Design a protein around this ligand. Structure first.
Ligand code: MG
Ligand code: MG
Ligand code: MG
Ligand code: MG
Lengths: 548, 489, 22, 139, 139
């Protein structure tokens, strides 16, 4: 059946406002005249793609029996000279002459661009034609554009398209409402908690919920395609009625899908777990606590009346786990994640760089909550004064763009910026002030217990000889780093593989699992060529930075 | 029979199942989809490298499925008159919808659908908005599914990449060894083969080849076989004897010849001029030769062993020593002998005058390296681009620092890191940044010392391997007399 | 009848220079 | 700032026209070290685009008579990179210096920041202020 | 010819290419020679205008798409091949790249014999010395 008003969710105030604007001045014209007002000429709708605009238009078309007249934006043009203006004029004339109708203009930006900074001439003619006609009762026009700033400002004025309605992304309750709306005509079996699914679904807006539902359903359909050996010759009967979507289907779909807004910046899945990051226990605990509180129970902060810090900087020597911690956060934080590499955004053209910075930060704010990991800040946020070289002033301009989009951050949207550099000396002192990256985490060289935990975390998924004492490796190893331990285990693995290949070749030669696990001798031989990655001067510099 | 079927494409099974699902299941068992209320996806976007097989998939769907099929080439829709492009799109969609449940295919959608924000030509933005409305809107679509193909999906307007318009994005990516085996079996199913041919070795030795590359390989092999017998019988236009027309038999040697000529199409631009050198040309330094060959040949020949332990291989090496010890010679030997692809890079080659193009160049080279993996990347004179991050205040706005940061992130960052082997060669290892010499970037620091007496003797024997000599000549004296000499002297 | 003509003229690029400090 | 040619100065131009229209107004220019960059610092440039922006600003700020009574607020962290041509008196004269808070100022700041804070009744911020001496307001 | 296809009018270059290929295929087993392809086949990412991107996409679709070709061969000539769209440098579109490089001594002698077959030479002129002393001559 036709989409009724119940079919929309996640927008209470906006839908109520649209109902007030569209129904009352059309269902009761006499009462408005008695009060002494008149209906507005038009109403604009804007917002991110896939939010419910077109849904709202069809719901208004269905609920009210008033005559309707659709004119899609790019459908007003014509090859014949000036027949486009005549078409639009005849559209409005028919809409008025027939009845107190309602007109919905979809994608107006295609036929309502800023009159200045244009090249064609028919576009100006149609813009002026619509401007003068709709500038001249009991009929209202609804415009729905995905990008509101590409409109001729002459239309954004009293008397013509005066009432705007910010159709935004939903909240948790609205998203749950949408989930309920879509799941009404579906077999949910008996084990499902949509409240948890909405609390975990963070950035999705409107249609993305439908995508989630469809994907979960598809997974369920896949489960019963071959497990029952479904006959492709003709349809089975009893299996069709035994279809029920489980929780695992929805979790599987959620683990695959991503918000449409972040679809461009999707990062390839790299598996890491919180037990994989050996050592640094307090750092992981503090990071989890600081990142989880604003999203899990902000009411405590509201009672406290103080907003949380939304930035953090990892600094320390190379090969300690900064990128490892960031990757683990990307994997197991239950929030969106945008990874950027230092000189990724810069471009030769003038301004494009800052355009990229604004686009990325806009994407971060849109799919809130989000965690943008800026790795190697010594490229985009180096010392402003230190950069004496005048590459045309681009570096200062990008630094200022980053400051304006990082310091101009409201309490809403909870965007957490993680910085990570191995040289803390190069970052501009403006950055390292509270309000942008207040917290400063230092990742020191591992200690004996930390080193043992790191080792156990590295070769956890590696069969090894049972009588092996990792504590020995940790002992007599003082200045090493996690990367060095990785090098040691990789050397041991290489020696084991070499022994395996030699034994297999010998076995094949004789013929025509010798080494199921790594022997202690492999580890003994791997340690002959192990050296510290970081010298003492670097440690001196980092200690000086810490003490300063 | 000649028409491509689903059996005529291989190397990608998951994506094949996904596309078969979307195109067939709502048109073969609709009641099953009527059972649960939710409707199936009705829009799919295929994206991937250029010669991966996207258009082949579209052709297979068109040939196999019994539903109506309508074809839209990318620039084909647009026309000169002012209001004709949108009229063409509307007419196309109306034709597809009116006739039957149908599949539209939009080939090279990147030409029709720009970002709608960076573009400046009006007609483009009106055609994009017309597409947006036609594909989704009031009375969106009855029983018509839309397939699009592109090579750069990031150049598409985000409004198209939303559910309802393009619901699922399938990635037709580079095959694997089993994929290359399947492709080879597909393309050699009708040609005439000699019994000696062994396709498994060919699939193993082809590294980074994607789709059409395999076809090129077989075609070249055939061409060589034709150029082996055309010398026997020639310019007999009226007729060719049946003894040579039959019993052609493309030998395995032909395939080896064609494999030696060709290279992965992705690396077409960055091919290195063939400088043939063998392992016997490198005298002395046997242990370094063994370590290098073991460190390169094990991950590419014995993947099962690494998985059995579940530990990643080391993927770095740095040669350092006095000039002329044999670093570049070792790199040349690796380039000529090892089966993996070779990327030869000079020191300052990657720098550029403009702002940001140096790091763009680095990203492109590493993108090619990660595309045709397993690959070897040789950074000659690594001290040229990777210098200590001293700030470079009296420099080109610290462009060297950004280059070093780009290299750092590219060799170890948010990447899958499948198989890229970086080889460094510097005669000044003190100027290299300490943040690259740690393990995980360049794991093995190999010192190439000055040759000893037996190493000088080995070098002398190696360098005279193709020269006629005096019978009584004893090179042992020359070795005994040179104490501090190097290979170059 | 009218017609729509396309035009794409140019843009603005940024160069990078090297300096020497005495 | 914009990539295309001419458009940049047009954007500064319409914003200042809008400012002139809704007089009185307060145009807040944050981070002038990006707009008012040291005139012609080095020959190496994008294309005198920073210089064109500065000239557009100079011609559009000198045409401020008594009428329309507009007021431009600047705010920078690094005052060393501000062009002297725009800091000249009669163009942009007033120079307020905002120093770091002192102990009494820090206590006032803390009391203003803890207005909407259900603090424990047996708590006083005077100790923190007396101890925290070189602590900025952000601290 | 290379830039022979470009038109001021919007959506006409591809019309010219389509008409050309249709004419080539409608007649007989034909050959299409496209001279100086670097002017109508750039990298599609360094370019900014839309008409070049669109013409390149039309060319790519023409050379390899549904209903690809039927006994027609495309030949191309270029002075710098690295500045060509990678999507064109693959089997099916441009199967093999022939390298027509500088001749060696024998090649130079062959060229000299070719170019001096219509002149009235003296008896005292030999070409072997001439082919020897000429080193970097491209023919
Ligand atoms: Mg819509
Ligand atoms: Mg890291
Ligand atoms: Mg194709
Ligand atoms: Mg060398």
């Amino acid at each position: 059946n036709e989409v009724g008003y119940d079919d929309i969710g996640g927008c209470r105030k906006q839908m109520a406002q649209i109902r007030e604007m569209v129904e009352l001045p059309l269902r009761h014209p006499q009462l408005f005249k008695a009060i002494g007002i008149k209906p507005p000429r038009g109403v604009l709708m804007y917002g991110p793609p896939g939010t419910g605009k077109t849904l709202m238009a069809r719901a208004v078309a269905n609920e009210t029996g008033a005559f309707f007249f659709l004119i899609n934006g790019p459908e007003v043009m014509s090859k014949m000279a000036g027949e486009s203006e005549s078409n639009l004029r005849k559209a409005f004339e028919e809409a008025e002459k027939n009845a107190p109708a309602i007109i919905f203009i979809d994608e107006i930006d295609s036929i309502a661009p800023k009159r200045d900074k244009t090249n064609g001439e028919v576009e100006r003619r149609v813009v002026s034609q619509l401007l003068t006609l709709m500038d001249g009762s009991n009929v209202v026009v609804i415009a729905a554009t995905n990008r509101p700033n590409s409109i001729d400002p002459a239309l954004r004025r009293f008397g013509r398209f005066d009432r705007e309605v910010d159709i935004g992304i939903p909240d948790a309750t609205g998203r749950l409402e949408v989930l309920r709306i879509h799941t009404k005509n579906m077999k949910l079996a008996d084990d499902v908690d949509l409240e948890a699914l909405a609390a975990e679904t963070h950035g999705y807006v409107g249609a993305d919920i439908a995508s989630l539902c469809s994907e979960a359903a598809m997974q369920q359909i896949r489960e019963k395609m071959d497990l029952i050996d479904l006959d492709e010759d003709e349809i089975d009967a009893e299996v069709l009625d035994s279809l029920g979507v489980t929780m695992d289907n929805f979790r599987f779909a959620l683990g695959n899908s991503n918000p449409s807004a972040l679809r461009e910046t999707v990062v390839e899945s790299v598996n890491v777990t919180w037990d994989d990051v050996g050592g640094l226990d307090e750092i992981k605990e503090e990071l989890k606590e600081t990142v989880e509180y604003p999203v899990l129970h902000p009411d405590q902060y509201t009672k406290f009346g103080l907003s949380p810090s939304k930035g953090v900087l990892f600094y320390g020597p190379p090969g300690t786990g900064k990128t490892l911690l960031a990757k683990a956060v990307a994997t197991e934080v239950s929030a969106n994640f945008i990874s950027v590499k230092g000189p990724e955004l810069l471009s030769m053209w003038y301004g494009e760089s800052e355009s990229n910075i604004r686009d990325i930060f806009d994407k971060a704010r849109a799919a809130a909550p989000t965690v943008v990991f800026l790795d190697e800040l010594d490229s985009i946020a180096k010392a402003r004064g230190g950069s004496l070289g005048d590459a045309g002033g681009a570096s200062d301009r990008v630094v200022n763009q980053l400051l304006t989009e990082m310091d101009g951050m409201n309490a809403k949207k909870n965007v957490f910026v993680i910085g990570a550099t191995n040289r803390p000396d190069q970052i501009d002192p403006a950055i390292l002030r509270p309000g942008r990256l207040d917290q400063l985490i230092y990742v020191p060289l591992p200690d004996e217990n930390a080193r043992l935990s790191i080792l156990n975390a590295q070769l956890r998924k590696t069969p090894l000889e049972p009588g092996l004492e990792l504590t020995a490796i940790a002992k007599a190893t003082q200045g090493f780093s996690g990367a060095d331990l990785l090098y040691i285990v990789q050397r041991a693995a290489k020696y084991a593989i070499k022994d395996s290949i030699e034994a297999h070749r010998q076995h094949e030669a004789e013929k025509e699992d010798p080494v199921p696990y790594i022997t202690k001798e492999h580890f003994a031989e791997a340690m002959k060529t192990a050296k510290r990655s970081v010298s003492d001067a670097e440690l001196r510099r980092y200690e000086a930075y810490s003490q300063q | 029979m000649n028409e491509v079927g689903y059996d005529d494409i291989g190397g990608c099974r998951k994506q094949m199942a996904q596309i078969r699902e979307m195109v067939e299941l709502p048109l073969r068992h609709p009641q099953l989809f009527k059972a649960i209320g939710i409707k199936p996806p009705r829009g799919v976007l295929m994206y991937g490298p250029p010669g991966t097989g996207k258009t082949l998939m579209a052709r297979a769907v068109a040939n196999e499925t019994g539903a109506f099929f309508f074809l839209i080439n990318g620039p084909e829709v647009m026309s000169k008159m002012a209001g004709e492009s949108e009229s063409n799109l509307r007419k196309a969609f109306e034709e597809a919808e009116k006739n039957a449940p149908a599949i539209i295919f939009i080939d090279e959608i990147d030409s029709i659908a720009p970002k709608r924000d960076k573009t400046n030509g009006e007609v483009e933005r009106r055609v994009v908005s017309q597409l947006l409305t036609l594909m989704d809107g009031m009375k969106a679509r009855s029983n018509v599914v839309v397939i699009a193909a592109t090579n750069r999906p990031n150049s598409i307007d985000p409004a198209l990449r939303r559910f309802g318009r393009f619901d699922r994005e399938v990635d037709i990516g580079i095959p694997d060894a089993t994929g290359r085996l399947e492709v080879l079996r597909i393309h050699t199913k009708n040609m005439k083969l000699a019994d000696d041919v062994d396709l498994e070795a060919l699939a193993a030795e082809t590294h980074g080849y994607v789709g059409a590359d395999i076809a090129s390989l077989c075609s070249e092999a055939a061409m060589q076989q034709i150029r082996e017998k055309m010398d026997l019988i020639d310019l007999d236009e009226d007729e060719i004897d049946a003894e040579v027309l039959d019993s052609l038999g493309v030998t395995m040697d032909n395939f080896r010849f064609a494999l030696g000529n060709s290279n992965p199409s992705a690396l077409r631009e960055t091919v290195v001029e063939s400088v043939n050198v063998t392992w016997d040309d490198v005298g002395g330094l046997d242990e370094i030769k063994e370590e290098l060959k073991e460190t390169v040949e094990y991950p590419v020949l014995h993947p099962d062993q690494y998985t059995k332990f579940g530990l990643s291989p080391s993927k770095g090496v740095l040669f350092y020593g006095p000039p002329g010890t044999g670093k570049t010679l070792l790199a040349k030997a690796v380039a000529t002998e090892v089966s993996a692809n070779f990327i030869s890079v000079k020191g300052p080659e990657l720098l550029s005058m403009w702002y940001g193009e140096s790091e763009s160049n680095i990203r492109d080279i590493f993108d090619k390296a990660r595309a045709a993996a397993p690959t070897v990347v040789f950074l000659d004179e690594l001290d040229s681009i990777a210098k200590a991050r001293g700030g470079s205040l009296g420099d080109a706005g610290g462009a060297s620092d950004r280059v070093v940061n780009q290299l750092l992130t590219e060799m170890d960052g948010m990447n899958a890191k499948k198989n890229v082997f970086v080889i460094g060669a510097t005669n000044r290892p003190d100027q290299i940044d300490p943040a690259i010499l740690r393990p995980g970037r360049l794991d093995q620091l190999i010192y190439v010392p000055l040759p000893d007496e037996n190493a000088r003797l080995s070098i002398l024997n190696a360098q005279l391997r193709k020269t006629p000599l005096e019978p009584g000549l004893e090179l042992t004296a020359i070795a005994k007399a040179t104490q501090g000499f190097s290979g170059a002297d | 009848a009218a017609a729509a003509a396309a035009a794409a003229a140019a843009a603005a690029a940024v160069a990078v220079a090297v300096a020497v400090a005495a």
